[PDB]
Amino acid sequence: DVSGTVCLSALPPEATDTLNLIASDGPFPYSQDGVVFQNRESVLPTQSYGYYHEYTVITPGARTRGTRRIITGEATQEDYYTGDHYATFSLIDQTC
Amino acid sequence: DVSGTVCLSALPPEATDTLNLIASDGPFPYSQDGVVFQNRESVLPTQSYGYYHEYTVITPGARTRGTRRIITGEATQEDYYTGDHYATFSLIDQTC
């Protein structure tokens, strides 16, 4: 299930950076940016393979790509944030 | 993010000195000169470990290494100046 909506202004600032890169189709910092998200645990609505894609939200100070991601779906403004490596997701509201 | 491009001639004269030392591969005045800059804070673009190196820009009168540095990247002409110990950076333009 999606755990509700979150305002974009409330997320780490790097979430805005990632959304801007998604809007321009990159260039992205990581080679794994833009791979298909398989939704293996069915936390997001079930869709055909390839509907969802994932992108890194950089965590400053982290030595890895970290645990923050944006997952896009195909619908307009269908962008989900996870801060916990795909355990929970929130729909991003870009208007607040 | 990088805060713009600045002409070399607009920087303190010591920045010119450090660039000339980098071009000759030293010798450098400080032992820390040439160590890897981690980009831990993700202020500069994401790159592999060892892409960036740090060099002192001497601050006149200081007893310590102070807060001024040049960070090189591996690309041609890719050099960043900070006067505030890595809080902000500007790209150096050696052509002006």
Ligand SMILES: Nc1nc2c(ncn2[C@@H]2O[C@H](CO)[C@@H](O)[C@H]2OP(=O)(O)O)c(=O)[nH]1
């Ligand atoms: N802030 C910061 N310091 C760095 C980085 N890479 C190397 N350093 C050095 O690591 C020290 C802290 O562990 C910092 O004081 C800085 O020392 P310098 O002043 O020698 O550059 C980096 O990515 N960020």
